[PDB]
Symmetry: D2
Subunit: 272 residues, 4 copies
């Protein structure tokens, strides 16, 4: 009997990286999956974004574990598309227990006094408004099940402290802590727990790119020596599995009374 046996989880940004890792982790532990990813290169985004074939690979991996998955290409900003995806997913699978609001854009990096309004607005829209949309379309289905459930937003240590050059990302992530606290207060009586995980740096294509290395100074090793200095434990970053394992704890029975919390998985970065 897996830790989430028979449950259904809705996961955004499931085509690669942490989102994929959560999908396979929860599936391995007995959950069926409603997965979305935008699967397209958004205007103004520099590095390669997930493709449909990436999402199809998440699908093949979940199915290999013996679980069902309903996947679609949806932008978290498109309220009607998000509503249709979760609605169709619950129709297929019969329930909804867990929501992992994980989809996000990383900052291109501009001082806030230099940034133009579209660059600020789009980041807030994906990372904050899209996170609210994700929970908003899913909650009615969790409530209909009458068994409680779990919502986890992925924030960042930049949800708890500032950083130069990425202020739009930083503000979007701070906003998630407000969303998390209200929703935890509103849904507590329904036994739906709402928490945040705050990674420092995670080995995914969001981090492991030439533009990021430059922002830390350059090879990956050049980057790793500077990344290590940000951590207290002797690591450059954590693995997607570390975030998935924290999330697995939070959605399990063992964490039944934990709500309203922001859990850093950051090798001690917040300490300094």
């Amino acid at each position: 009997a897996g830790k989430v046996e028979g449950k259904v989880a809705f996961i955004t940004g499931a085509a690669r990286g942490q989102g994929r890792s959560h999908a396979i982790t929860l599936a391995r532990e007995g959950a069926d999956i409603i997965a979305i990813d935008v699967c397209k290169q958004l205007d103004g985004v520099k590095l390669p974004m997930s493709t449909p074939d990436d999402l199809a690979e998440t699908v093949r991996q979940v199915e290999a574990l013996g679980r069902r998955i309903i996947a679609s290409q949806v932008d978290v900003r498109d309220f009607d598309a998000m509503q249709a995806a979760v609605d169709d997913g619950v129709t297929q699978l019969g329930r909804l227990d867990i929501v992992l609001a994980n989809a996000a854009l990383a900052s291109e990096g501009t001082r806030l006094n230099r940034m133009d309004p579209k660059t600020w607005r789009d980041m807030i829209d994906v990372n904050l408004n899209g996170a609210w949309i994700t929970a908003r379309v899913a909650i009615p289905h969790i409530m209909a099940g009458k068994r409680g459930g779990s919502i986890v937003f992925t924030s960042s240590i930049g949800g708890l402290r500032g950083a130069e050059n990425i202020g739009n990302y930083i503000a979007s992530k701070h906003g998630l802590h407000g969303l998390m606290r209200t929703m935890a207060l509103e849904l507590g009586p329904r036994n739906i727990r709402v928490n945040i995980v705050c990674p420092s740096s995670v080995a995914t294509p969001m981090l492991l790119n030439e533009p990021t290395y430059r922002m830390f100074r350059p090879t990956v090793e050049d980057f790793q020596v500077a990344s290590r200095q940000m951590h207290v434990l002797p690591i450059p970053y954590v693995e997607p599995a570390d975030i998935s394992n924290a999330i697995l704890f939070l959605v399990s029975d063992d964490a039944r009374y934990i709500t309203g919390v922001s859990l850093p998985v950051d090798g001690g970065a917040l300490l300094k």
Copy 2:
């Protein structure tokens, strides 16, 4: 000589309430003022918003103190119009030292699992994106003055904790804390300090209205301001139902004065202890 003698402050939502109080407090203490307010009833807001006459009253009170004020009707969401208003104010007045990001919408009250996406997004746009716009159009003029400056965002005890029914307002206010910390880090080396004040409840039209009394007293049919004050006093630790606009202006005056020259990146509650419980 006053605490902000010879300086210039840009203040949003200056038509009434805390914005007007800030204008007159800083004007009393020697500053000239660039004042904006939307002065229009925005689609989806039920309570009466400030009028053009309201902004003209702020002007009259500032001019009565012998200070100069350049006022205009500008939505904080409107990047080009905000750019123009601050550019023109700096042209007329000569410099910019202080930015008070004060304009905001109150939440009408709707559970996050029932809220419409426009209701959610408009609130973020005014309260968070508009606050960013406010700072962004002003910073270049503060930078060019080469004397440093101060930027103060008005958050809320709702920027530091959640509350039922007003989660779009909560999220928007929490977002300011990250905008403030980033901007404090980026501008600190040029002696521009960036801080937040977090009021609990403030005696302005945003608080003192029947829909608010109902939200505080959902147990009663037609709650009065007195019924509201009972509930409100219970939220505070000091024996008060709310603070005055002047209490916020006084905290702001301290933060922008030489007495707070090395204070940056802080969130200062003015909340009668409400955050303690």
Copy 3:
């Protein structure tokens, strides 16, 4: 099949009953041997019944029923020399030390800070904060000597993160733990020793479930019962529960000391039914 702390040794203070017992049995179920201490006597001026030697003997029985070794002794966490002796003799017997759970504490007598005697203040700080430091201090040399890293968890409280009337000595001591935890996490992190805090709200143990506590929670009633207490306590939480179980705290600790939490350090993890949200 290996449990989550298979082959490890945990030093647990306040192990005679309540949360400390629960941690001892949870970690033993998951493959750890235990060094367990508790003062096992009614301390001067403490008005709630403290653990007895029989209580500690019961923790021992339950740990040994799980097929694990336990070295248990009656030690006051304030007594540096005896704490040092206990841990040293325990490591001599078991061969290593991996995990430290600084759990022992006294609950507050409930006096306003402006009426409190200096002895009442000092003793609370000495047990809950200084004794917590002593606990880590005597253990860390053994963890380092093992060259495998390790885990230290202090038990704080939601009262380590916010204040409460009437219990301010306890509140101060618990706040102090967050500073202890942070420095220690910084100092020991390069050696792969993770250091964290758990912050329970209210936990179903004799520290909570006593008439003086029910009276403190219901100043509106003349003689409150446990049920009157549960009513108010449920209103203080966001999930509608009056308290968590010792097992909920043990399960959070088990996560934190396990490989699944290998890169978590410097955190305070509330296990609080959302109490901190309001």
Copy 4:
């Protein structure tokens, strides 16, 4: 004008020099009379020279030059009876008590928490945390008796909000203040007594400007100068400064105890040049 604290009386610990002296003169300039104490002795295990009786007389000279009254004496904040006698005697002589600034403290010598001996840990907690409680405890009855409310300000540190290696006893002690402050704010708020904390980063006093502190800031350097320290200290601030002046802390405190801050309580106000941001 009347000053911002006209006619009020402030009890200030650690008044012989540095910040405590700056508070006393600043409040005096703004109309307050002063009850000042300082231990005025070299305490055992403290390496750098501490305040002397002559330092305290110099604070007295400055307050009296501003035309105010000051009752000054040599008291250790850890000494409950002596602390009670000082404040009782000061109130007898000056007529009332409105403001308490718990400012006295020891700076950590610098030892890893896994190597520190128990006296080194305990003495630091006893001065910085217990002594701060004693300070508020002996003063509160006089403030309450005035029925006019008042203000209590504890001086913490950015080390009350985050950890640092080598100074763990200091860090724990300052974190404990935030607990003391919160409970006291909750207990005294219905009486209109506000209770707050100020958190300086580094302040230009003998506690900061000394060769052992220089060495702590530049452990990379053989015999670091004050300039070498200022380079590293500036790196840790966000504003282009190496420290704040005692007057910066006094000015924040003046704000907090003035009518302009009448509704601010329970808050921790960093005066830190943005050090906490990174």
